[PDB]
Amino acid sequence: MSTPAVSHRFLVNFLFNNIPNPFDIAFQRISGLSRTLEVSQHREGGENVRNLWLAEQVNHGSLVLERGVMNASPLTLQFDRVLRRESTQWANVVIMLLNELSLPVTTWTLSHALPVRWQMGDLDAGSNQVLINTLELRYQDMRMLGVKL
């Protein structure tokens, strides 16, 4: 059987409408994409032994990203504009894992992602650590691709 996919190589591509060039930014800690369907349980009168689950509404999670405090990229300059309320532009994000050669084995492809939260790491006098800042986006739809679905 083919070997499963490990989780320490990944590219992320962003495409805003403010910014003319699509840019690719390296992260440390992409959190993880959930997708819940939100059923509800109904209880019938004469039926006491089975359950009844009724499908309603697909809920998508959130894209939480982590990287170090490095030079100003086109994405930390873009969260600065949205969190100062100077723009409300959102982007189409493409996230993909890479195998041993270079090849994309799975792709996640988020749509209309909106920057909603910046979170700075701690400043501590005895710490021995890189200052990590936490970024967080809310998207509208999600569409996973690739050969390793």
């Binding site: 190589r9 590219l11 992320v12 390296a26 440390q28 021995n128």
Partner: protein, 49 residues
């Protein structure tokens, strides 16, 4: 032929002859150890390698 003024420049130094000045005075000790310079280490990895 090595002429021991060259030993004072080229050869290494042994450990048994040392003096310890402690503040404003010298105190004769037998051993002395632990004068290290040690650093911690900070790392960072991202998904591109």
């Amino acid at each position: 032929a090595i002429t021991a003024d060259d030993i004072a420049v080229q050869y290494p130094i042994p450990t048994y002859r040392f003096i310890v000045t402690l503040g404003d005075e010298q105190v004769p000790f037998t051993s002395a150890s632990g004068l290290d310079i040690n650093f911690d280490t900070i790392e960072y990895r991202d998904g591109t390698g």
